[PDB]
Every structure is written in C-alpha cells, then in structure tokens.
C-alpha cells in the first residue's frame, strides 16, 4: 500500500502552471526517504517541517501539485512571494506547511524551434488566493474601454506561451515543480511513514 508518488514525479507529461495538476494522496504509507535522498532535484525546500522526520508523521490530506515553469521563476513558488507566477498562476499561503521540489527538464520539455504548449497567465484583475486555480480565457480589460471579445488597445489575451528552446540559458529552461501540501484536520490521518 505504498503511496503513488512515482506516477506524479515520473509522469511523462506535465501540466501548465495556470492549469496546474493536483493529485490527492490518501490511505497509503509514504517513504519520503526515496525523495529527499535522491539528488535529482535542483531545489528541495520544505516549510514548517524538514523531510528527515517526514517518515515519522501522519497527515490527513496530502496534495501533490505538478506543473512546469521557468527556472528563474522557481523562486516564486514559496510562501510570501510576489510575481507573475505567484500572483496569477499558483499561490502559496503564508502559513504553508509542506515541501516544494523542482528539477530541470530541458531534455524533456524543450525542443528545437520552441515548445509553445506550456502557457502562463499574464494579467488578472486581482491577486490569486492560495491554492485557487483559474482557467478562464476571457479578454482582460486593461482600463478605460471594454474589449467586446477582441484584443488591441488595452485589451490583451490573458495567457502567454513560454517558448522553451534547448539552447537557452538555465534561467529560461523549463523546470518541473511538485508541491507537496500536508494538511491536518479533524479527519483520520490516512497517510503515514514507515
């Protein structure tokens, strides 16, 4: 009854950050030593808990959120951070408890001529609330006049493509990010460690 963290990290395809994928973990035992001992991760930052004792704790609800972002934007997946990705695509609460894991995926998500299948939200009316997902593709009115469904003067499409090319710098190369959120409620803690 091992927790299926394998199909999250080892998944062939990842989702866009604006449409970040979420997997629910329940009724299993999780061996976190497989994760924090593997040096295949560029960033591994845990808030409210360190990974070493994660094998001795039990939680009620675990969420694994997978997406792909820019390298120089991995710093934005953290509590109390501001920026395009944090404010408009994926927000973390200031009281976040859990881990953020990110690794370079240039060999998998980049292609010659540009990979444009990954999108991110550029504009929004208000900052994103934590863990809230917005997949609306309506025209963003940037001020005085409305848009009527067309772009142009102060009227832009909310989503923009990333354009991942393999010869780009580490700051432009794609990175795959998994956010493990641990939640303790007045509900039975179904996940545990060995």
């Amino acid at each position, epitope marked *: 009854n091992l927790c299926p963290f394998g199909e999250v990290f080892n998944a062939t395809r990842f989702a866009s950050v604006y449409a970040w994928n979420r997997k629910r973990i329940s009724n299993c035992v999780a061996d976190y030593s497989v994760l924090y001992n593997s040096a295949s991760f560029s960033t591994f930052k845990c808030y409210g808990v360190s990974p070493t004792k994660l094998n001795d704790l039990c939680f009620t609800n675990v969420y694994a959120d997978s997406f792909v972002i820019r390298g*120089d934007e991995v*710093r934005q997946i953290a509590p109390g951070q501001t*920026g395009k990705i944090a404010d408009y695509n994926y927000k973390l609460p200031d009281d976040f408890t859990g881990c953020v894991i990110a690794w*370079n995926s*240039n060999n998998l998500d980049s292609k010659v001529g*540009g990979n444009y299948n990954y999108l991110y939200r550029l504009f929004r009316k208000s900052n994103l609330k934590p863990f809230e997902r917005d997949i609306s593709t309506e025209i963003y009115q940037a001020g005085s006049t409305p848009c009527n469904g067309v772009e142009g003067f102060n009227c832009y499409f909310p989503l923009q493509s990333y*354009g991942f*090319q*393999p*010869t*780009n*710098g*580490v*700051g*432009y190369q794609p990175y795959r990010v998994v956010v493990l959120s641990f939640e303790l409620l007045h509900a039975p803690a179904t996940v545990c460690g060995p």
Partner: antibody
Amino acid sequence: EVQLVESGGGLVKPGGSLRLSCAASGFTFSSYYMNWVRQAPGKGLEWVSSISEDGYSTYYPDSLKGRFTISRDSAKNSLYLQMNSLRADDTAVYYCARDFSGHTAWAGTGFEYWGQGTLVTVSS
Amino acid sequence: QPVLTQPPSVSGAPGQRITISCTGSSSNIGAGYDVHWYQQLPGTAPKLLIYGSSSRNSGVPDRFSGSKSGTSASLAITGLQAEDEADYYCQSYDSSLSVLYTFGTGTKVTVLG
C-alpha cells in the same frame, strides 16, 4: 540605437569596495538579461556576473567567492556592480552587456551588445 | 574556471582562407549549447560577430562563417583583408550554475604582405 555607457571606474585600495554603473538606452530594459564581464590589460575575457530581467535572480562564477553583487534598477534603466574585498588581480576593463532576447533561441547565453567599458585599477 | 582553448594567433595572406578552432568539453559545447564569436579591434570593446554557432550578426560580411561539431567549433574567414586584424573570442554556456558563460582563450589574427 542601443547604447550602454559605463561609469565609476578608477582607483581603489586593496580590500576596498567599488560600485560600477551602466546606463542603458534604445531598448526595453526590463526585457533582457544583463551581464558584467571583465578583461585584464592584455588578457582574455572573463564573465563576471549575470542578472535576470526581473532582477530577482543573480548568477556568479565560483571563482569570485561571492564578493561581487549585481543589481538592476528599472526606475533609471541602470545596472550596478558592487565589488568588495578587491585585490590587484581585479584590475581590469569592465563591460556591461545586454543578453539576447527571450524570444530568440540563445536567451541568456551570450552578449549581443557591449559598452565602452571602464578601467578599474586596484592599487595601494 | 574552465575555458575554451583556441590557437594563440593565426596569420595568412590577404587572399586566402583561415580558420580559428575553439575546443570545448562535454559540459559546454557537447551539452547542446551554441557558440558565439566576438571580434575586438585594438583599443575598442568587443563586438558580437557570430551567434548561434553559424549565424552572422547584422553588418557582418559573408566572408565570416561559423560551424560546430561534437565538442568543438570553428570560425572561418575567406578572403582575408587588412581590416580583419583583431582578437577573436569564442564563447559557450555551461548548465552548471558555478560556470555558466564560458569564454574562449582568444586568437590574434594578422595579415601578411
């Protein structure tokens, strides 16, 4: 159209600190990576530092031991390099440079445009 | 800090073709990163001459060409002229955050005649 002008070079004592400035014009400043490179008199080129378009990610080589700091200011479209614990080996002509566009295939890989450069001489 | 090795100087008559080599490792050129060539005239700042390991910057004559293969790259000048006397540097990229931009040794080009 693209213009990069450096300033602040001069004399500094060994172990001292200096601040080099680079004003940029002719392009959207906040859309490009910025870089600092240096060339010792009669020697080759050495990349010194790099900063992203948003200015929140900084990159340095391990040889500098983190005594160099790169910063950018969009309110003035300027790039700043702070050098600390300077030594005689750091005497060189320093150039600020603009990287390739994020739309291109070599974003954050080279130095498309260069400045006039400024001479920094570390001497007692 | 690793570098890219080039011949210290290459010379030729002002009618022939010369080549400048640029040897890298599996970490910079063999890792899938292109090579840029910069030309520095005496007393002036370096200028971008070649980007993408084959493409010519604006204002660069067709006499200059670039190529890369394996862990190495080359810059070819056909029809040497007296204005070509300068320093030529190759440059590539390393994925490691401790290296990143890797510069070439530099080559002094001179014309004879």
